[PDB]
Design a protein around this ligand. Structure first.
Ligand SMILES: CCCCCCCCCCCCCCCCCC(=O)OC[C@H](CO[C@@H]1O[C@H](CO[C@H]2O[C@H](CO)[C@H](O)[C@H](O)[C@H]2O)[C@H](O)[C@H](O)[C@H]1O)OC(=O)CCCCCCCCCCCCCCCCC
Ligand code: CLA
Ligand code: CLA
Ligand code: CLA
Ligand code: CLA
Ligand SMILES: CCCCCCCCCCCCCCCCCC(=O)OC[C@H](CO[C@@H]1O[C@H](CO)[C@H](O)[C@H](O)[C@H]1O)OC(=O)CCCCCCCCCCCCCCCCC
Ligand SMILES: CCCCCCCCCCCCCCCCCC(=O)OC[C@H](CO[C@@H]1O[C@H](CO)[C@H](O)[C@H](O)[C@H]1O)OC(=O)CCCCCCCCCCCCCCCCC
Ligand SMILES: CCCCCCCCCCCCCCCC(=O)OC[C@H](CO[C@@H]1O[C@H](CS(=O)(=O)O)[C@@H](O)[C@H](O)[C@H]1O)OC(=O)CCCCCCCCCCCCCCC
Ligand SMILES: CCCCCCCCCCCCCCCC(=O)OC[C@H](COP(=O)(O)OC[C@@H](O)CO)OC(=O)CCCCCCCCCCCCCCC
Ligand SMILES: CC1=C(/C=C/C(C)=C/C=C/C(C)=C/C=C/C=C(C)/C=C/C=C(C)/C=C/C2=C(C)CCCC2(C)C)C(C)(C)CCC1
Ligand SMILES: CC1=C(/C=C/C(C)=C/C=C/C(C)=C/C=C/C=C(C)/C=C/C=C(C)/C=C/C2=C(C)CCCC2(C)C)C(C)(C)CCC1
Ligand SMILES: CCCCCCCCCCCCCCCCCC(=O)O
Ligand SMILES: [Fe+2]
Lengths: 32, 34, 28, 341, 38, 82, 65, 115, 37, 57, 505, 30, 33
C-alpha cells in the first residue's frame, strides 16, 4: 500500500518519546 | 662462583651465532656483479 | 658437495677452539 | 613430587629469561618465525610465485626484500614441507612459497605462546592479567589480516607479504580495490591508533610537567624512588591545568590508565572487523545516492567521485604486474588516463 | 590406497612426535638434575 | 636484584671472553661469506643467478601455475636454461 | 528453601558438589583421547585442504554423484 | 581539503607525486604513531594490572582512587616485576619519571619527523 | 519465602553519562552517512 | 573551482554531500599563493566560487 | 553500586534466576525465528525457483527450514515448484507458529523460575549454600546431547523416521529432500558427501552417550578440578565460549567454501565457482557433446537449462557485494526474467572472439576481447586517438544462440558494445529493474551475509573467552592486587621459583 | 532529511560539550 | 539525493535507544543520593 513514508518515524517517536519520559520518572522514584 | 652455560647463554648464542654468519654472507653479497 | 665443507670448516674450528679454551672451567 | 611437579619447578625458576610452560610453545615458534623471515629475506627469491626479486642475494635492500606469499595456484594449501606440493624437497618448497605459510603459522602459534606467557607470569607474580587482555588486539589484527582475509579470497597470494615495501603495496591494493579508507571500521581504527598516540604523548608530557620537587638537581629523574609511597607528580595541578586549557580533565588516575588501555585496543579490534568484511569483498566501496546523481548529472563532482577515479587508475595500472597469474593484457588504449599524463 | 600424501602425513606425524618427545625428554632430564632447594 | 648469571659487562671486558670470540666471530663471518662466494647459497635455496631469470630470448615470467605439478613445472623451467 | 516434588526426584543429581577423585585420577587417559582427537582433526583438516589426498575421496562438488 | 574524503584525496595524490610511503620520515611517523599506541596500551595495561585492592567486586575499581590522595594507587614494583620477567629485567622501567618522559618523547619525536 | 538477597543497586555517574552520550552521538554521526547511503 | 579549470567541486551538505564526502574545498589554482580576503573579491558570489572560505578558515 | 557493565553478575550465585534468564533468552531466540519466518513468508515469491530462487530474494531462515525437509506452504506451493502439494502441519507456516508458541511457553516458565528462585534443589545439602555440581551436570547434558545427536542422525536424516535432508547433483539443478544413507568409509569425511553427515551424527552421538556416562559416574581428578576451578561457574562460561567460537569459525568456512550442508540451491553459488569457471566448464561440456552428435549451434545452446546458465553469471557470485548495499540481490541487478542466449562475438575475419570475464576483485573492468589463443583482438578504448582495436575498426559482431535472442545477430557497433559490456559478467540475462526499483549495483547473497556475520561473531567471542577465562583464573585479584605484596616476591633472585615462597635462598 | 539529520547530531554534540564543561561533576579533593 | 528511506529511522533509533538507556540509569542514580 502506498502509505506515507514518514508515518513510520512519526508512529515510532509518538510511542518512544512519551513512554521513555514515564519510564525515567518511574525508575527514579523506585531508587529513592 | 658463576656458571658459564645457562639458558641465557643458549638464548644469546641462538641469536648471535647466525647473525654474524648472515652478516658475513650479506657482506659477500656487495661484491656480486651482474 | 665440496662447498659444504668449505662453508663448514671455520664453524667447526671455531667450536673446536672454544671447546678447548673453556673446557677446564666447564668441568668445574 | 612426581616428574610433572619437578618439571614445573624447573620451568618457573627465576632466571634472566623466564621460560614457563608457555615457553615451550613460545620460544621455538617465535624463533622459527623470526628465523624464517631473516632466512627468506636474505636468500630466497619470489621469482616463481610473483615474478619478483626479494632477497639481499638477488640485489634487494632492506626496504624491498620480502618473504612473499605463495602463487595463486596454491590455493590455501598449508604448503607443508612434506606435503603433496613440495614433496620434501627443501629447495622447491622455498621457491613455491613454503616460507610464507611457515612464518605465518609459526608466528600465529608464537603469538598464542606470548599471550600465554603474559598469563603465566601474571599469575605467578600476583598481578591482574590486563596486559594479556590488551594483547588480544594485536592478535586480532594478525589473524584477521594474515589468515582470515586471504582465506576469504582465492589464495594466500593476496595476503600481505612479510616485507616493508610489500606491505606498502598491500596498503595501496586495499585503496584501489576495496576503497578501504572509506570504511568506518578502518576509521575507528585510525581514531584509536592516533588517539592512543595522543594519549601517550599528553599523559607523558603532563606528568613530566607537574612533577613535585623531590631533590635539588636540575635533572628531575634522580628524584624518584621506585618504592616511595607518594605520587611523584601533582594530579591536582594537572587537573586544573587541563580544565582551564581544554575544558575537561581527568580526575581519576584509575580511569585515566584504563582509558589508555581501552582506546588503542578498541581501535585495533574495530579495524580487524572491517578486514573480515574485506575477506568477502564486503566493502564500503560506494555511496549509492552519489552514484545515481553523478550518473545522471555530469556537473556533479565530489571528493568521493574524485577518489574513485584514482582507484580505477590504481587497478588498471597495477593489476597486470601485481596479479601475474591472470595474464591481464591491457592495450595502451584501454588504460584509463587523464589529459596529457 | 596408501597414497604419497598419506605417507607424507605419517612422516610429518612422526617428525613432530620426535621433536616434542626429544624436547620433553631433555626438559625432564634437566629438571631432575637441577632441582630447587626447599 | 640478579638471578645468578654472570653480568654481561663483566663478561665482555674479560680477556678469556675475547680470546674465544676473536676466533669464533671471524670464523662465522668467513663461513657465511663462503656460503655466498662459493655459490652454494644459490643452490640450497633455489634462487636465480643473474644469468638465469630468463632464457636468452625469453621475456615471460616462469610462473608456477599448478598446485600439484608445481614441483615439475619449476623443473621444466630450469631445463629451459641448461 | 522450597521443596517440590520434582526437586526431590532430581535432588541426588545435585548433591556431590566438590567431590573429586584423588590426585591425578584419570588425567593420563584423558590425555590419550586428546591426542587421538588432534590427529583426527588434523586428517579432517588436511583432507578439506587437499594436503592429504585419499583414494576415492574427491573433495569437490562432483562428489555429489 | 577540510573534509574526510578530501583528506583521502590529498593522501593518494601525495603518494603518486612523492612516494611518501618510501620516505623515511613517514616511516618514523608510522613508528611514532604505532609505537605510541603500543606504549599507550602497555602503560595503561601495566598500571591497571597493578592497582592496589581497595574495593569489592560489586564496585568499580576506580572508586579506590580519590582525587588528590597522596599515596600512589598502584604498585610500580609489582608492575616492574611483571614486565621485567615478560621480557627481561633491564627492558622494564623502575623509574616513573623516565617512563613517562619516554612516553612523551617517542610519539612527539616520531610526529616531528612525519611533519 | 524471603526476598531475593542477590539484588544490587546500579549506578551511572554524570561523567559516565557524558562519555556514553558522546560515544553514541559520534557513532551516529559516523554511520548515518552509510545508513542513508 | 579548486583546480582553476572552471570545474567546480561540490563540498557542502546542501549541495549533495554527506558527512563523509563533504568538505570545505581548497581555493582555486588560479589564485595560487595570492591572498584572497573577502574584500579583494568583486562580490561574495565570486569569493565563494573561487574558494575564499578555505583561506579564511 | 554495580556499574552498568556488571548488572547481570547478580545471577552468579542464583541458579533459579539464572535459569529464569536462560529461559528468557531462549524465548527471545525462538520468538525471533518465528517472526523471521513469517516475515520471509510474507515477502517470498515462490513462483520461479529457476531464475528467482530464495537466495536471490534475501531469504535467510527459509533455506534452513528447507535444508532439513520443510519445503511447502499451507498455501499450496513448494520451493521445488510442485503445486497442489499438501505439506501437513510442518509447513513453513506451522514451523513458524511452533516457535512462537514455544517462545510464549518459555516466557511463562521464566516468570515462574524468577519468582520461585529459592528451590532447595539448588542448595548444597551439607552446607545450605546454593551450589551447582558442574561436573555431573556436564555428564547429564552431554548424555542428552548424545541421544539427540544420535537420534537426529539415525532417524531424521536417514528417513527411518523423518524426512531426510536437501541433496542435489553437483551443479545445483535437481535438488530435493531425500533420505541419506550413512557413508562409513573414509569418503564420509569428504565435506561434499552427504552420507558422512549421517555417519557423523550416528557415531558422534554414541561417543556422546558414552562420554556422558563417564562424566555422570566419574569424578574429576583433584588436580584438574583445582587447575580449572571447577567449583566456579565462570570457567564453564570460559570454555563454553571457546567451543562456541570454534564452531562459528567452522560454519563460516563451510558456508564460504561449500559443503554438503550448504547447497547452492538454498544459499546460492560460492565465489570459487566463478573463480574456476565451474559452471562454464560444464556448459561448454554439454554444448560440445551436443555438437559432436550433429546438433546445430542453435540447437546445442538451446538445450542449456536456463538454471545452469544463471549460475554462470557474476551477479550471483557472493564476492561481488558491499557492506552497506542492503537487501536482496534482486534490488541490485533486478529480478531475472529470461536468459537472453549465449553471445558469440566474431571479428570481420570470422574469427570467434572471447570477452575476458570480470574477476571478483574488480568493481569495474575494461572490455577486452581475445582469440582462442589469448591474443587481444578488440577492445573498447579509453583514449580514442590511437586505438587499434575498437569494435568499429575490427568489425565486431555478436550472435546469440539459445535463449530469448536465439538466432539473432547484431552488427551496429554500439549495440555490440552493449552486449560485450554485459558479457564480462558471464551469461546474459533480462532483468526487471522496475518492480523493486533496482539500482543496478551488485549485492551479496545469503552465503556472503552468513559467512560475514559468523566470522565476526567468532572473532568477538574469542575476546569473550579471553576475558571470562582471565576472570576465572584470576578471580582472587579482580578487585586489585594484594596491598601487602612485599617487594621480595616480585624482585629478582629472592626466590628460586617465581612466586613460590618456599624456594627462598 | 539527511542534511537535517547530520546537523541535528552535530548540534547535540555541541550542546553536550557545553554541559560537560560547565555542568561537570566538580572534582573535589578527597 | 536518492538516499535509503530507512536510514532516517535507523539513525533516530540508533541515537535514541542507547541514549535513553543511559539517561534512565543516570537519573535513578542521582536520586539515590
Ligand atoms: C583466534 C584464535 C587464535 C588462534 C589461531 C590459531 C591458528 C591456527 C591456524 C589454522 C590453519 C587454518 C587452515 C585452513 C585452511 C583452509 O581453510 O583451506 C581452504 C580449504 C578449502 O579449500 C579451498 O576450496 C576452494 C573451493 O573449492 C571447491 O570449489 C571448487 C569450485 O567449485 C571445486 O569444486 C573444488 O573441487 C572444491 O573443493 C578453492 O578450491 C580454494 O582454492 C581451496 O583452497 O578449507 C579447509 O582447509 C577447511 C575449511 C573448512 C573449515 C573452516 C576452517 C575455519 C577457518 C576458516 C575461517 C575463515 C572463514 C573464511 C571466511 C572469512
Ligand atoms: C612447539 C613447537 C612447534 C610447533 C607448534 C610447530 C608447529 C608447526 N610447524 Mg614447526 N618445527 C618446530 C617446532 C614447532 N612447530 C621445530 C623445533 C622445528 C625444527 C626442528 C620445526 C620445523 C618445521 C618445518 C620444517 C615445518 C614445520 C611446520 C609446522 C606446521 C605443521 C606441523 C605438523 O603438521 O605437525 C604434525 C605432527 C604432529 C601434530 C605431532 C603431534 C604428536 C601427537 C600428539 C601424537 C603422535 C603419535 C606418534 C606419531 C606415534 C609414535 C609412533 C611410535 C609408537 C613408533 C605447524 C604450524 C611445517 C610448516 O610450517 O608448513 C608450512 C613445516 O614444513 N615445522
Ligand atoms: C523441539 C525442538 C526444536 C525443533 C525441532 C526445532 C527445529 C528447527 N528450528 Mg528451532 N529452536 C528451538 C527448538 C526447536 N527447533 C529452540 C528451543 C530455539 C531457541 C533457542 C530455536 C531457535 C531457532 C533459530 C534461531 C532458528 C531455528 C531454526 C529451526 C530449523 C532448523 C534447525 C537447524 O538448522 O538446526 C541447526 C542445528 C544446530 C545449530 C546444531 C549444532 C549444535 C552444536 C554443533 C552442538 C554443540 C556440541 C555438543 C553440545 C557436544 C558434542 C556432543 C557430541 C559428542 C554428541 C528447524 C525447523 C532455524 C529456522 O529456520 O528458523 C525459522 C533458525 O534460524 N530454531
Ligand atoms: C546472523 C544474522 C543475520 C544475517 C546473516 C541476516 C541476513 C540477511 N537478512 Mg536478516 N535479520 C537478522 C539477522 C540476520 N539477517 C535479525 C536479527 C533481524 C531482526 C533485526 C533481521 C531482520 C531482517 C529484515 C527485516 C530484513 C533482513 C534481510 C536480510 C538480507 C539482507 C541483509 C542486509 O542488507 O544486511 C545489511 C547489514 C548491514 C547494513 C550491516 C550493519 C551492521 C552495523 C555496521 C553494525 C553496527 C556498528 C556498531 C555499533 C559498532 C560500534 C561498536 C563499538 C565501537 C563498541 C540477508 C539475507 C532483508 C531481506 O532481504 O529480507 C528478505 C530484510 O528486509 N533481515
Ligand atoms: C554466552 C555468552 C556470554 C555470557 C553469558 C556473558 C556473561 C557475562 N559477561 Mg561476558 N562477554 C561475552 C559473552 C558472554 N558474556 C563476549 C562475546 C564478550 C566479548 C564482546 C564478552 C565480554 C565481556 C566483558 C568485557 C565483560 C563481560 C561481563 C559479563 C558479565 C556481566 C554482563 C553484564 O551485566 O552485561 C550488561 C550489558 C548491558 C547492560 C548492555 C550491553 C549491550 C551491548 C553493548 C550490545 C547489545 C547486544 C544485543 C542486544 C544482543 C546480543 C546480540 C548477539 C550477541 C547475539 C556476565 C557474567 C562483564 C564482567 O565480567 O563483569 C564481571 C564485563 O566487564 N563480558
Ligand atoms: C517529540 C517528537 C515528536 C513525537 C511525535 C512525532 C509525530 C508527531 C505527531 C504528528 C504527526 C505528524 C503528522 C504525520 C506525519 C506526516 O507525514 O507529516 C508530514 C508533513 C509534511 O508532509 C510531507 O511534506 C512533503 C514535502 O514537504 C511531501 O509533501 C510529503 O508527501 C508529505 O508527507 O509534516 C508536516 O507537515 C508536519 C506538520 C506539523 C504542523 C502541523 C500544525 C497543525 C497542527 C495544529 C493542531 C494541533 C492540535 C493538537 C490537538 C490537541
Ligand atoms: C645477541 C644477537 C642478537 C641478534 C639480533 C638478531 C635480530 C635480527 C635483527 C633484524 C635486522 C634486520 C635488518 C637487516 C638489514 C640488512 O641486513 O640489510 C642488508 C642490506 C644489504 O644491502 C643490499 O645488499 C645487496 C647485495 O646484493 C645490494 O648490494 C643492495 O644494493 C644493497 O642495498 O643493507 C641495507 O638494506 C641497507 C642497510 C640499512 C638497513 C638498516 C635497517 C635497519 C633499521 C630499520 C629500522 C628498524 C627495523 C627494526 C628491525 C631491524
Ligand atoms: C631436532 C630437534 C631440535 C630441538 C631439540 C630439543 C632441544 C631443546 C631443549 C634445549 C633446552 C636447553 C636449555 C638448557 C641449557 C643448559 O645449559 O641448562 C642446564 C643447566 C645449565 O647450568 C646451570 O644453569 C643454571 C641456571 S639456568 O637454568 O640455565 O637458568 C644454574 O642453576 C646451575 O647452577 C648451572 O650449572
Ligand atoms: C629504549 C629502551 C630503554 C628502556 C629501558 C628502561 C630502563 C631499564 C634499566 C633501568 C636501570 C638500568 C641500570 C643500567 C643497566 C642497563 O641498562 O642494562 C644493560 C644490562 C647490563 O646488565 P649486566 O647483567 O651486564 O649487569 C648488571 C648491571 O645492571 C650492573 O651494572 O645489559 C642488558 O640488559 C643487556 C640485555 C641484552 C641481553 C640479550 C639477551 C637475549 C634476549 C633473550 C631473548 C629475548 C627475551 C625473550 C622475551 C620474549
Ligand atoms: C627457516 C628454517 C629454519 C630456521 C632457520 C633459522 C632459525 C634461521 C635463523 C637466522 C637468523 C637468526 C639470522 C640472523 C640474521 C641477522 C642479521 C642479518 C642482522 C642484521 C643486523 C643489522 C644489519 C643491524 C644493524 C644496526 C643498525 C642498522 C643500526 C644500529 C646498530 C645495528 C648494528 C643494530 C630451519 C633450520 C628450521 C629449517 C626450515 C627453514
Ligand atoms: C505469551 C504467550 C504466547 C504468545 C507468544 C508471543 C506472541 C511471542 C512473541 C515473541 C516474538 C515475536 C519475539 C521476537 C523477538 C525478536 C527478537 C529477539 C529480535 C532480536 C533482534 C536483535 C538482537 C537485533 C540486533 C541487530 C540489529 C538491530 C541491527 C543489526 C545487527 C543486529 C543483528 C545485532 C502464547 C500465545 C504462545 C501462549 C501463551 C503465552
Ligand atoms: C608439533 C611440533 C611440530 C614439529 C614438526 C616439525 C617438522 C620436522 C621437519 C620434518 C621435515 C622432514 C620431512 C621431509 C621428507 C618428506 C619426504 C616425503 O614427502 O615423502
Ligand atoms: Fe601514568
Amino acid at each position: 500500500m502506498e502509505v506515507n513514508q514518514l508515518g513510520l518515524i512519526a508512529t515510532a517517536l509518538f510511542v518512544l518519546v512519551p513512554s521513555v519520559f514515564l519510564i525515567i520518572l518511574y525508575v527514579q522514584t523506585e531508587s529513592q | 662462583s658463576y656458571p658459564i652455560f645457562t639458558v641465557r647463554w643458549v638464548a644469546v648464542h641462538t641469536l648471535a651465532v647466525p647473525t654474524i654468519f648472515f652478516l658475513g654472507a650479506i657482506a659477500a653479497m656487495q661484491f656480486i656483479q651482474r | 658437495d665440496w662447498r659444504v665443507l668449505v662453508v663448514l670448516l671455520p664453524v667447526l674450528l671455531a667450536a673446536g677452539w672454544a671447546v678447548r679454551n673453556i673446557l677446564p672451567y666447564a668441568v668445574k | 613430587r612426581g616428574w610433572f611437579d619437578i618439571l614445573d619447578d624447573w620451568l618457573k625458576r627465576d632466571r634472566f629469561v623466564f621460560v614457563g610452560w608457555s615457553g615451550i610453545l613460545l620460544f621455538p615458534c617465535a624463533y622459527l618465525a623470526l628465523g624464517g623471515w631473516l632466512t627468506g629475506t636474505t636468500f630466497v627469491t619470489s621469482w616463481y610465485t610473483h615474478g619478483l626479486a626479494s632477497s639481499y642475494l638477488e640485489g634487494c635492500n632492506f626496504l624491498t626484500v620480502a618473504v612473499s606469499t605463495p602463487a595463486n595456484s596454491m590455493g590455501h594449501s598449508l604448503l607443508l614441507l612434506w606435503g603433496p606440493e613440495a614433496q620434501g624437497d627443501f629447495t622447491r618448497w622455498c621457491q613455491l612459497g613454503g616460507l610464507w605459510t611457515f612464518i605465518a603459522l609459526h608466528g600465529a602459534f608464537g603469538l598464542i605462546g606470548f599471550m600465554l606467557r603474559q598469563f603465566e607470569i601474571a599469575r605467578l607474580v600476583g598481578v591482574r592479567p590486563y596486559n594479556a587482555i590488551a594483547f588480544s588486539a594485536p592478535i586480532a589484527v594478525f589473524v584477521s589480516v594474515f589468515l582470515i582475509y586471504p582465506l576469504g579470497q582465492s589464495s594466500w597470494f593476496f595476503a600481505p607479504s612479510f616485507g616493508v615495501a610489500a606491505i606498502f603495496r598491500f596498503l595501496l591494493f586495499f585503496q584501489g580495490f576495496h576503497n578501504w579508507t572509506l570504511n568506518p571500521f578502518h576509521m575507528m581504527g585510525v581514531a584509536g591508533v592516533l588517539g592512543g598516540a595522543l594519549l601517550c604523548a599528553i599523559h607523558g608530557a603532563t606528568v613530566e610537567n607537574t612533577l613535585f620537587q623531590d631533590g635539588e638537581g636540575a635533572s628531575t629523574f634522580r628524584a624518584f624512588n621506585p618504592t616511595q609511597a607518594e605520587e611523584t607528580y601533582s594530579m591536582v595541578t594537572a587537573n586544573r591545568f587541563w580544565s582551564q586549557i581544554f575544558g575537561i580533565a581527568f580526575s581519576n588516575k584509575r580511569w585515566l590508565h584504563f582509558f589508555m588501555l581501552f582506546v588503542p585496543v578498541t581501535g585495533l579490534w574495530m579495524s580487524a572487523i572491517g578486514v573480515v568484511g574485506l575477506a568477502l569483498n564486503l566493502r564500503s566501496y560506494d555511496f549509492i545516492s552519489q552514484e545515481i546523481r553523478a550518473a545522471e548529472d555530469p556537473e556533479f563532482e565530489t571528493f568521493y567521485t574524485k577518489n574513485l577515479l584514482l582507484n580505477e587508475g590504481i587497478r588498471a595500472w597495477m593489476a597486470p604486474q601485481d596479479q601475474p597469474h591472470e595474464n591481464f593484457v591491457f592495450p595502451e588504449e584501454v588504460l584509463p588516463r587523464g589529459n596529457a599524463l | 590406497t596408501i597414497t604419497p600424501s598419506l605417507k607424507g602425513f605419517f612422516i610429518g606425524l612422526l617428525s613432530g612426535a620426535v621433536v616434542l618427545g626429544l624436547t620433553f625428554a631433555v626438559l625432564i632430564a634437566i629438571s631432575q638434575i637441577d632441582k630447587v632447594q626447599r | 636484584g640478579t638471578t645468578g648469571e654472570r653480568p654481561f659487562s663483566d663478561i665482555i671486558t674479560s680477556v678469556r671472553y675475547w680470546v674465544i670470540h676473536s676466533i669464533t666471530i671471524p670464523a662465522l663471518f668467513i663461513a657465511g661469506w663462503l656460503f655466498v662466494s662459493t655459490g652454494l647459497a644459490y643452490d640450497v635455496f633455489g634462487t636465480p643467478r643473474p644469468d638465469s631469470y630468463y632464457a636468452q630470448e625469453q621475456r615471460s615470467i616462469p610462473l608456477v601455475t599448478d598446485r600439484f605439478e608445481a614441483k615439475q613445472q619449476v623443473e621444466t623451467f630450469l631445463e629451459q636454461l641448461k | 528453601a522450597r521443596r517440590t516434588w520434582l526437586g526431590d526426584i532430581l535432588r541426588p543429581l545435585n548433591s556431590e558438589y566438590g567431590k573429586v577423585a584423588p590426585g591425578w585420577g584419570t588425567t593420563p587417559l584423558m590425555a590419550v583421547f586428546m591426542g587421538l582427537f588432534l590427529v583426527f582433526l588434523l586428517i579432517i583438516l588436511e583432507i578439506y585442504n587437499s594436503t592429504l589426498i585419499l583414494d576415492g575421496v574427491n573433495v569437490s562438488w562432483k562428489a555429489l554423484g | 581539503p577540510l573534509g574526510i574524503s578530501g583528506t583521502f584525496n590529498f593522501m593518494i595524490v601525495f603518494q603518486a607525486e612523492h612516494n611518501i610511503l618510501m620516505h623515511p620520515f613517514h616511516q618514523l611517523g608510522v613508528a611514532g604513531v604505532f609505537g605510541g599506541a603500543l606504549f599507550c596500551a602497555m602503560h595503561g595495561s601495566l598500571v591497571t594490572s597493578s592497582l592496589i585492592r581497595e574495593t569489592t567486586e560489586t564496585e568499580s575499581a576506580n572508586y579506590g582512587y580519590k582525587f588528590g590522595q597522596e599515596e600512589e594507587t598502584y604498585n610500580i614494583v609489582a608492575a616492574h616485576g611483571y614486565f621485567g620477567r615478560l621480557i627481561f629485567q633491564y627492558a622494564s622501567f623502575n623509574n616513573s619519571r623516565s617512563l613517562h618522559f619516554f612516553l612523551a618523547a617517542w610519539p612527539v619525536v616520531g610526529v616531528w619527523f612525519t611533519a | 519465602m524471603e526476598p531475593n538477597p542477590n539484588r544490587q543497586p546500579v549506578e551511572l555517574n554524570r561523567t559516565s553519562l557524558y562519555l556514553g552520550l558522546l560515544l553514541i552521538l559520534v557513532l551516529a554521526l559516523l554511520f548515518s552517512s552509510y545508513f542513508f547511503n | 573551482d579548486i583546480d582553476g579549470i572552471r570545474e567546480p567541486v561540490s563540498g557542502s551538505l546542501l549541495y549533495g554531500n554527506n558527512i563523509i564526502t563533504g568538505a570545505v574545498v581548497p581555493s582555486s589554482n588560479a589564485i595560487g599563493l595570492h591572498f584572497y580576503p573577502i574584500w579583494e573579491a568583486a562580490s561574495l558570489d565570486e569569493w565563494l566560487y573561487n574558494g575564499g572560505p578555505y583561506q579564511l578558515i | 553500586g554495580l556499574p552498568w557493565y556488571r548488572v547481570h553478575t547478580v545471577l552468579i550465585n542464583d541458579p533459579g534466576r539464572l535459569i529464569a534468564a536462560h529461559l528468557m533468552h531462549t524465548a527471545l531466540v525462538a520468538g525471533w525465528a518465528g517472526s523471521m519466518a513469517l516475515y520471509e513468508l510474507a515477502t517470498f515469491d515462490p513462483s520461479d525457483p529457476v531464475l528467482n530462487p530464495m537466495w536471490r530474494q534475501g531469504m535467510f531462515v527459509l533455506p534452513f527450514m528447507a535444508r532439513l525437509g520443510v519445503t511447502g506452504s499451507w498455501s499450496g506451493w513448494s520451493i521445488t515448484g510442485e503445486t497442489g502439494i499438501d505439506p501437513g502441519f510442518w509447513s513453513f507456516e506451522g514451523v513458524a507458529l511452533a516457535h512462537i508458541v514455544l517462545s510464549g511457553l518459555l516466557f511463562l516458565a521464566a516468570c515462574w523460575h524468577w519468582v520461585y528462585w529459592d528451590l532447595e534443589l539448588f542448595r548444597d545439602p551439607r552446607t545450605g549454600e546454593p551450589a551447582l555440581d558442574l561436573p555431573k551436570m556436564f555428564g547429564i547434558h552431554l548424555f542428552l546431547a548424545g541421544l539427540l545427536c544420535f537420534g537426529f542422525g539415525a532417524f531424521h536424516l536417514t528417513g527411518l523416521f523423518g524426512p531426510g535432508m536437501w541433496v542435489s547433483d553437483p551443479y545445483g539443478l535437481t535438488g530435493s529432500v531425500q533420505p541419506v544413507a550413512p557413508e562409513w568409509g573414509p569418503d564420509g569425511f569428504n565435506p561434499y558427501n552427504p552420507g558422512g553427515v549421517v555417519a557423523h551424527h550416528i557415531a558422534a552421538g554414541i561417543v556422546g552417550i558414552i562420554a556422558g556416562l563417564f562424566h555422570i559416574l566419574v569424578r574429576p581428578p583433584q588436580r584438574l578440578y583445582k587447575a580449572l576451578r571447577m567449583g566456579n561457574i565462570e570457567t564453564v562460561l570460559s570454555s563454553s565460549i571457546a567451543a562456541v567460537f570454534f564452531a562459528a569459525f567452522v560454519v563460516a568456512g563451510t558456508m564460504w567454501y561449500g559443503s554438503a550442508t550448504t547447497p547452492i540451491e538454498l544459499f546460492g553459488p560460492t565465489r570459487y565457482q566463478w573463480d574456476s569457471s565451474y559452471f562454464q566448464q560444464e556448459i561448454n561440456r554439454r554444448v560440445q557433446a551436443s555438437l559432436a552428435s550433429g546438433a546445430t549451434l542453435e540447437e546445442a545452446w538451446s538445450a542449456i537449462p536456463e538454471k545452469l546458465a544463471f549460475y554462470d553469471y557474476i551477479g550471483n557470485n557472493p564476492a561481488k557485494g558491499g557492506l552497506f548495499r542492503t537487501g536482496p540481490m534482486n534490488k541490485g541487478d533486478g529480478i531475472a526474467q529470461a536468459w537472453k542466449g549465449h553471445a558469440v562475438f566474431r571479428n570481420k575475419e570470422g574469427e570467434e572472439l572471447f570477452v575476458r570475464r570480470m574477476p571478483a576483485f574488480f568493481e569495474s573492468f575494461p572490455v577486452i576481447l581475445t582469440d582462442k589463443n589469448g591474443v587481444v583482438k578488440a577492445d573498447i578504448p579509453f583514449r580514442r586517438a590511437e586505438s587499434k582495436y575498437s569494435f568499429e575498426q575490427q568489425g565486431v559482431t555478436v550472435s546469440f544462440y539459445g535463449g530469448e535472442l536465439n538466432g539473432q545477430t547484431f552488427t551496429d557497433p554500439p549495440t555490440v558494445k552493449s552486449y560485450a559490456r554485459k558479457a564480462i559478467f558471464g551469461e546474459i540475462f533480462e532483468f526487471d529493474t522496475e518492480t523493486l526499483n533496482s539500482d543496478g549495483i551488485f549485492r551479496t547473497s545469503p552465503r556472503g551475509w552468513f559467512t560475514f556475520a559468523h566470522a565476526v561473531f567468532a572473532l568477538l567471542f574469542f575476546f569473550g573467552h579471553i576475558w571470562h577465562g582471565a576472570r576465572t583464573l584470576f578471580r582472587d585479584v579482580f578487585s586489585g592486587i594484594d596491598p601487602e605484596l612485599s617487594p621480595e616476591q616480585v624482585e629478582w633472585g629472592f626466590y628460586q621459583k617465581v612466586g613460590d615462597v618456599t624456594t627462598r635462598r | 532529511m539527511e542534511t537535517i539529520t547530520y546537523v541535528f547530531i552535530f548540534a547535540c554534540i555541541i550542546a553536550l560539550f557545553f554541559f560537560a564543561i560547565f555542568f561537570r561533576e566538580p572534582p573535589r579533593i578527597t
